[PDB]
Amino acid sequence: EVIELNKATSGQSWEVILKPPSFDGVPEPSLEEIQKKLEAAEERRKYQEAELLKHLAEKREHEREVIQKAIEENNNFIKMAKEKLAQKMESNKENREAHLAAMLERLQEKDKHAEEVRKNKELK
Amino acid sequence: MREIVHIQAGQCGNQIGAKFWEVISDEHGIDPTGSYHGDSDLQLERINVYYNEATGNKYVPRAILVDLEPGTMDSVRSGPFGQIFRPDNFVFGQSGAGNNWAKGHYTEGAELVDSVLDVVRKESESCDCLQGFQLTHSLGGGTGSGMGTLLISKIREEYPDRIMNTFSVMPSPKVSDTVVEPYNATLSVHQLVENTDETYCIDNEALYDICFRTLKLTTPTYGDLNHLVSATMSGVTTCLRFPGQLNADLRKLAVNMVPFPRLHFFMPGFAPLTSRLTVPELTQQMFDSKNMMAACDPRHGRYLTVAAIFRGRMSMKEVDEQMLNVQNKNSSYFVEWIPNNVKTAVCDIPPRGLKMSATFIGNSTAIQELFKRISEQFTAMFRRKAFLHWYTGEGMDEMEFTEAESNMNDLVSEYQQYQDATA
Amino acid sequence: MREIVHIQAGQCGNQIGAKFWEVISDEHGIDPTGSYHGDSDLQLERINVYYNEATGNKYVPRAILVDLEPGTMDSVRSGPFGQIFRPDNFVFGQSGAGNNWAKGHYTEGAELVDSVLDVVRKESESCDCLQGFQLTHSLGGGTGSGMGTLLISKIREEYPDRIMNTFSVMPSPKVSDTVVEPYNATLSVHQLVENTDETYCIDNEALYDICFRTLKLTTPTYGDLNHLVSATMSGVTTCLRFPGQLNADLRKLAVNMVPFPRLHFFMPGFAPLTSRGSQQYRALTVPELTQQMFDSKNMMAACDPRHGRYLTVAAIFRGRMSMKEVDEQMLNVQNKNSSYFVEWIPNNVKTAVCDIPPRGLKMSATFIGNSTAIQELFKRISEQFTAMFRRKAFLHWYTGEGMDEMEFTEAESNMNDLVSEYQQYQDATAD
Amino acid sequence: MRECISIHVGQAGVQIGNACWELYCLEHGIQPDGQMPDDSFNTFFSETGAGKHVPRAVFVDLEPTVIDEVRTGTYRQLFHPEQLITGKEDAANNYARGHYTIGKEIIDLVLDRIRKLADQCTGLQGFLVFHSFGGGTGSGFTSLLMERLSVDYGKKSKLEFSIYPAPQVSTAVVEPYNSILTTHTTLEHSDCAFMVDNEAIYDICRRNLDIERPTYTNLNRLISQIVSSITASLRFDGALNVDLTEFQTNLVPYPRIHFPLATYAPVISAEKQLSVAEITNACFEPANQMVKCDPRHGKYMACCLLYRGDVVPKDVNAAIATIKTKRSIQFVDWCPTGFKVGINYQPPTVVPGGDLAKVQRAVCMLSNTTAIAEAWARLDHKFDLMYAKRAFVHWYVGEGMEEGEFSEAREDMAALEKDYEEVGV
Amino acid sequence: MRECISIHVGQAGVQIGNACWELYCLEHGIQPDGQMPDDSFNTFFSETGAGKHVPRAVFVDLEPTVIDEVRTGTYRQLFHPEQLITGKEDAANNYARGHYTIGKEIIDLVLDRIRKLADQCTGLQGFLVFHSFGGGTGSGFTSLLMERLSVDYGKKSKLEFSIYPAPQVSTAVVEPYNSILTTHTTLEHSDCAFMVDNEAIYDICRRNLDIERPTYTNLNRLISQIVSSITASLRFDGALNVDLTEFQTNLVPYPRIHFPLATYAPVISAEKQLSVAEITNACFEPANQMVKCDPRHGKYMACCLLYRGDVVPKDVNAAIATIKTKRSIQFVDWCPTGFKVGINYQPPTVVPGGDLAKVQRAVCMLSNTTAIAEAWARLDHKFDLMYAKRAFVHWYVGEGMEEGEFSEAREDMAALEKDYEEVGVD
Ligand SMILES: Nc1nc2c(ncn2[C@@H]2O[C@H](COP(=O)(O)OP(=O)(O)OP(=O)(O)O)[C@@H](O)[C@H]2O)c(=O)[nH]1
Ligand SMILES: Nc1nc2c(ncn2[C@@H]2O[C@H](COP(=O)(O)OP(=O)(O)OP(=O)(O)O)[C@@H](O)[C@H]2O)c(=O)[nH]1
Ligand SMILES: Nc1nc2c(ncn2[C@@H]2O[C@H](COP(=O)(O)OP(=O)(O)OP(=O)(O)O)[C@@H](O)[C@H]2O)c(=O)[nH]1
Ligand SMILES: COc1ccc2c(c1)NC(=O)CN2c1nc(N2CCOCC2)nc2c1CCC2
Ligand SMILES: COc1ccc2c(c1)NC(=O)CN2c1nc(N2CCOCC2)nc2c1CCC2
Ligand SMILES: Nc1nc2c(ncn2[C@@H]2O[C@H](COP(=O)(O)OP(=O)(O)O)[C@@H](O)[C@H]2O)c(=O)[nH]1
Ligand SMILES: [Mg+2]
Give Cα separations from C193 to C150, C398, C415, D386 (angstroms): 13, 21, 8, 101
The identity of residue B386, as a single letter, is A
- Please list every residue in chain C whose beta carbon sits closer than 8 Å to the beta carbon of residue E213: 323-324, 327
Q: Which chains touch E (3 or more CB pairs under 8 A)?
A: A, B, C
Q: Are D13 and D132 in contact (CB under 8 A)?
A: yes
Rounded to a whole number, what is the distance in Å from the CA of A103 to chain C's nearest CA? 8
Same domain, residue pair C225 and C369: no
Q: Are B161 and B132 in contact (CB under 8 A)?
A: no
Radius of gyration for the alpha carbons in chain C, expressed in angstroms and rounded: 21
Q: Which of C211, C237, C222 is nearest to C23 (CA)?
A: C237
b/e map B258-274, b = 16+ CB within 10 Å: bbbeebbbbbbbbbbbe
Backbone angles phi, psi at C21, to 5 degrees: -70, -35
Outline where B258-367 has alpha helix (H). 279-284, 316-329
Q: Which of E178, E189, E187 is nearest to E401 (CA)?
A: E178
Q: Which residues pair with D362 in a beta bridge?
A: D308
Question: Which string of DSSP letters, residue by residue, matches D304-347?
Answer: EEEEEES--HHHHHHHHHHHHHHS---B-TTS-EEEEEEEE-SP
Q: Which of B69, B61, B52, B53 is nearest to B18 (CA)?
A: B61
- D246 in active site: yes
The three state secondary structure string of chain C is CCCEEEEEEHHHHHHHHHHHHHHHHHHHCECCCCEECCCCHHHCCCHHHCEEECCCCEEEECEEEEECCCHHHHHHHHCCCHHHCCHHHEEECCCCCCCCHHHHHHCHHHHHHHHHHHHHHHHHHCCCCCCEEEEEEECCCCHHHHHHHHHHHHHHHHCCCCEEEEEEEECCCCCCCCCCHHHHHHHHHHHHHHHCCEEEEEEHHHHHHHHHHHCCCCCCCHHHHHHHHHHHHHHHHHHHHCCCCCCCCHHHHHHHHCCCCCCCEEEEEEECCCCCCCCCCCCCCHHHHHHCCCCHHHECCCCCHHHCCEEEEEEEEEECCCHHHHHHHHHHHHHHCHHHECCCCCCCEEEEEECCCCCCCCEEEEEEEEEHHHHHHHHHHHHHHHHHHCCCCCCHHHHCCCCCHHHHHHHHHHHHHHHHHHHHHHHCCCC
Same domain, residue pair B347 and B402: no
Question: Which string of DSSP letters, residue by residue, matches A62-78?
Answer: HHHHHHHHHHHHHHHHH
Pairing of strands D361-369, E4-9: unpaired
The topology under which CATH files domain D4-250 is Rossmann fold (3.40.50)
CA torsion, points C275, C276, C281, C282, in degrees to nearest 10?
Answer: 70
Q: Which residues pair with E342 in a beta bridge?
A: E306
**Residue C34, exposed/middle/buried by CB under 10 A (0-12, 13-18, 19+)?**
buried
The rounded distance, in Å, linking the Cα atoms of E25 and E19 is: 10
Tell me how far apart the 2 most distant CA atoms of chain D are, in Å.
61
**Residue C1, exposed/middle/buried by CB under 10 A (0-12, 13-18, 19+)?**
buried
Helix (H) / strand (E) element for E13: namely: helix E10-28
Pairing of strands B3-9, B63-67: parallel
CB atoms within 10 A of CB C24: 23
The answer to whether E371 is annotated as binding is: no
Same domain, residue pair B240 and B284: no
Same domain, residue pair C408 and C338: no
The identity of residue D88, as a single letter, is K
Evaluate whether residue A12 is within a structural domain: no
Q: Which of E130, E128, E5 is nearest to E57 (CA)?
A: E5
The rounded distance, in Å, linking the Cα atoms of B181 and B375 is: 11
The answer regarding whether domain D376-424 maps to CATH 1.10.290.10 reads no
Assign domain E374-424 one CATH number from 3.30.470.20, 3.40.50.1950, 1.10.287.600, 1.10.260.30: 1.10.287.600
Report the CATH number that the domain containing residue C360 is assigned in CATH: 3.30.1330.20
Report the CATH number that the domain containing residue B128 is assigned in CATH: 3.40.50.1440
CB atoms within 10 A of CB C364: 24
Pairing of strands E157-164, C51-53: unpaired
The rounded distance, in Å, linking the Cα atoms of E77 and D51 is: 99
Q: Are C239 and C246 in contact (CB under 8 A)?
A: yes
Assign domain D261-375 one CATH number from 3.30.565.10, 1.10.10.10, 3.90.1150.30, 3.30.1330.20: 3.30.1330.20
Angle subtended at Cα C193 by Cα C187 and Cα C194, rounded to the nearest 5 degrees: 100
- C-E interface: how many C-beta pairs under 8 angstroms? 71
Of C268, C292, C321, the residue at which a domain comes to its end is C268
Give Cα separations from D132 to B398, D10, D119, D160 (angstroms): 54, 7, 28, 10
Structure letter (DSSP) for residue D50 = T
E237 and chain B in contact, CB less than 8 A: yes
Name, in order, each residue with C-beta under 8 angstroms of D270's C-beta and a sequence gap of 6 or more: D350, D354, D355, D356, D357
Same domain, residue pair C243 and C340: no
Asked whether C173 lines ligand 1 (CB < 6 A), one says no
Name, in order, each residue with C-beta under 8 angstroms of D121's C-beta and a sequence gap of 6 or more: D1, D3, D5, D56
User: Could you say which of E96, E147, E154 has the minimum Cβ distance to residue A74?
Assistant: E154
Name, in order, each residue with C-beta under 8 angstroms of D43's C-beta and a sequence gap of 6 or more: D1, D2, D3, D4, D56, D125, D234, D235
Pairing of strands B130-138, B90-92: unpaired
Pairing of strands D157-164, D126-132: parallel
End-to-end Cα distance, chain B: 36
Cis amide linkage into residue B272, ω under 30° from 0: yes
The rounded distance, in Å, linking the Cα atoms of C431 and C361 is: 45
Name, in order, each residue with C-beta under 8 angstroms of A44's C-beta and a sequence gap of 6 or more: D400, D402
Q: Which residues pair with E157 in a beta bridge?
A: E126
Backbone angles phi, psi at E39, to 5 degrees: -100, -10
- Which of B105, B114, B117, B157 is the mutation pick for testing A, counting most A CBs within 10 A? B157
Evaluate whether residue A11 is within a structural domain: no
Give Cα separations from C202 to B145, C14, C168 (angstroms): 77, 15, 6
CA torsion, points A82, A83, A88, A92, in degrees to nearest 10?
Answer: 100
- Please list every residue in chain E whose beta carbon sits closer than 8 Å to the beta carbon of residue C251: 92
The identity of residue E283, as a single letter, is C
Question: Which string of DSSP letters, residue by residue, matches D144-167?
Answer: HHHHHHHHHTTT-EEEEEEEE--T
Give Cα separations from D111 to D78, D185, D201 (angstroms): 21, 18, 32
Q: Which residues pair with C370 in a beta bridge?
A: C312
Angle subtended at Cα B374 by Cα B200 and Cα B289, rounded to the nearest 5 degrees: 55
Determine the distance from the C-alpha atom of residue E53 to the mean position of all C-alpha atoms in its chain, rounded to a whole number.
24
- B-E interface: how many C-beta pairs under 8 angstroms? 85
The rounded distance, in Å, linking the Cα atoms of D156 and D195 is: 21
Same domain, residue pair C422 and C325: no
Q: Which residues pair with D266 in a beta bridge?
A: none
Q: Are E164 and E223 in contact (CB under 8 A)?
A: no
Evaluate whether residue A121 is within a structural domain: yes
A69 and chain E in contact, CB less than 8 A: no
Determine the distance from the C-alpha atom of residue B147 to the mean position of all C-alpha atoms in its chain, rounded to a whole number.
16
CB atoms within 10 A of CB B97: 31
**Cβ-based interface (< 8 Å): residues of C facing A:** 102, 105-107, 110, 150, 153, 156-157, 160-161, 194-195, 400-404
Name, in order, each residue with C-beta under 8 angstroms of E324's C-beta and a sequence gap of 6 or more: none
**Residue B15, exposed/middle/buried by CB under 10 A (0-12, 13-18, 19+)?**
buried
Q: Helix, strand, or coil here: B137?
A: strand
Same domain, residue pair B179 and B39: yes
Sign of CA dihedral C358, C361, C364, C369: negative
Outline where D102-135 has alpha helix (H). 103-118
The identity of residue E160, as a single letter, is E
Where does residue E162 fall: left (phi above 0), alpha (psi -120 to 50 degrees), or beta otherwise? beta
The rounded distance, in Å, linking the Cα atoms of D410 and D182 is: 11
CA torsion, points C409, C411, C417, C423, in degrees to nearest 10?
Answer: -120
Question: Which string of DSSP letters, residue by residue, matches B202-254?
Answer: EEHHHHHHIIIIIS--SS--HHHHHHHHHHHHHHHTHHHHS--SS---HHHHH
E389 and chain C in contact, CB less than 8 A: yes
Angle subtended at Cα E46 by Cα E44 and Cα E52, rounded to the nearest 5 degrees: 120
Of C250, C268, C286, the residue at which a domain comes to its end is C268
Tell me the residue range of the domain where C138 lies: 3-268
Same domain, residue pair B52 and B196: yes
Backbone angles phi, psi at C352, to 5 degrees: -130, 155
Q: Which of C331, C256, C372, C250 is nearest to E386 (CA)?
A: C256
Q: Which residues pair with B207 in a beta bridge?
A: none
Backbone angles phi, psi at D406, to 5 degrees: -55, -55
Helix (H) / strand (E) element for B96: namely: none
Outline where D46-135 has alpha helix (H). 64-71, 95-96, 103-118
b/e map C102-118, b = 16+ CB within 10 Å: bbbbbbbbbebbeebbe
The rounded distance, in Å, linking the Cα atoms of E274 and A105 is: 70
Evaluate whether residue A48 is within a structural domain: yes
The rounded distance, in Å, linking the Cα atoms of D423 and D333 is: 9
- Of D69, D246, D405, D417, the catalytic one is D246
The rounded distance, in Å, linking the Cα atoms of B100 and B79 is: 27
Same domain, residue pair B10 and B77: yes
Evaluate whether residue A3 is within a structural domain: no
Helix (H) / strand (E) element for B172: namely: none
Tell me the residue range of the domain where A71 lies: 23-124
The identity of residue B12, as a single letter, is C
The identity of residue B211, as a single letter, is C
Q: Are D227 and D221 in contact (CB under 8 A)?
A: no
Evaluate whether residue A52 is within a structural domain: yes
Same domain, residue pair C358 and C284: yes
Same domain, residue pair B205 and B278: no
Q: Which of E165, E212, E218 is nearest to C326 (CA)?
A: E212
N residues, chain A: 124
Evaluate whether residue A5 is within a structural domain: no
Contacts 24+ apart (CB under 8 A), C149-152: C149/C105, C149/C187, C149/C188, C149/C191, C149/C192, C149/C195, C150/A114, C150/C104, C150/C105, C150/C106, C150/C109, C150/C110, C150/C113, C151/C7, C151/C9, C151/C66, C151/C113, C151/C116, C152/C191, C152/C192, C152/C195, C152/C196
Outline where E102-162 has alpha helix (H). 107-118, 136, 142-153
The rounded distance, in Å, linking the Cα atoms of E97 and D231 is: 111
CB atoms within 10 A of CB C292: 22
Q: Are B244 and B31 in contact (CB under 8 A)?
A: no
Distance from Cα B266 to the centre of ligand 4, integer Å: 12
Evaluate whether residue A66 is within a structural domain: yes
Q: What is the total count of domains within chain A? A: 1
What angle separates helix C148-158 from helix A31-123, to the nearest 10 degrees? 150
The rounded distance, in Å, linking the Cα atoms of E231 and D400 is: 60
Name, in order, each residue with C-beta under 8 angstroms of B328's C-beta and a sequence gap of 6 or more: none
Q: Which of E343, E270, E253, E331 is nearest to E298 (CA)?
A: E331
Rounded to a whole number, what is the distance in Å from the CA of B396 to chain A's nearest CA? 6
Q: Are D343 and D307 in contact (CB under 8 A)?
A: yes
Q: What is the total count of domains within chain C? A: 3
Question: Which string of DSSP letters, residue by residue, matches E51-106?
Answer: S-EEESEEEEESSSHHHHHHHHSTTTTTS-GGGEEE-SS--TT-HHIIIIITGGGT
Same domain, residue pair B408 and B293: no
The rounded distance, in Å, linking the Cα atoms of D320 and D314 is: 10
Contacts 24+ apart (CB under 8 A), A70-73: A70/B106, A70/B107, A70/B393, A70/B394, A70/B395, A71/B395, A73/B393, A73/B395, A73/E155
Asked whether D368 lines ligand 2 (CB < 6 A), one says no
Of C374, C392, C416, the residue at which a domain comes to its end is C374
Structure letter (DSSP) for residue E366 = E
Structure letter (DSSP) for residue E418 = H
The answer regarding whether domain E261-373 maps to CATH 3.30.1330.20 reads yes
Tell me how far apart the 2 most distant CA atoms of chain E are, in Å.
62
Pairing of strands D337-344, A11-19: antiparallel
Name, in order, each residue with C-beta under 8 angstroms of B348's C-beta and a sequence gap of 6 or more: B311, B312, B313
- Please list every residue in chain B whose beta carbon sits closer than 8 Å to the beta carbon of residue E241: 71
Q: Are B105 and B144 in contact (CB under 8 A)?
A: no
The rounded distance, in Å, linking the Cα atoms of D268 and D356 is: 6
Helix (H) / strand (E) element for B51: namely: strand B51-53
The rounded distance, in Å, linking the Cα atoms of C200 and C206 is: 13
Resolution in A: 2.3
Domain boundaries, chain D: 4-250, 261-375, 376-424
Report the CATH number that the domain containing residue B402 is assigned in CATH: 1.10.287.600
The rounded distance, in Å, linking the Cα atoms of C201 and C377 is: 9
What is the CATH number that goes with domain E3-251? 3.40.50.1440
User: Could you say which of E104, E151, E402 has the minimum Cβ distance to residue A81?
Assistant: E151
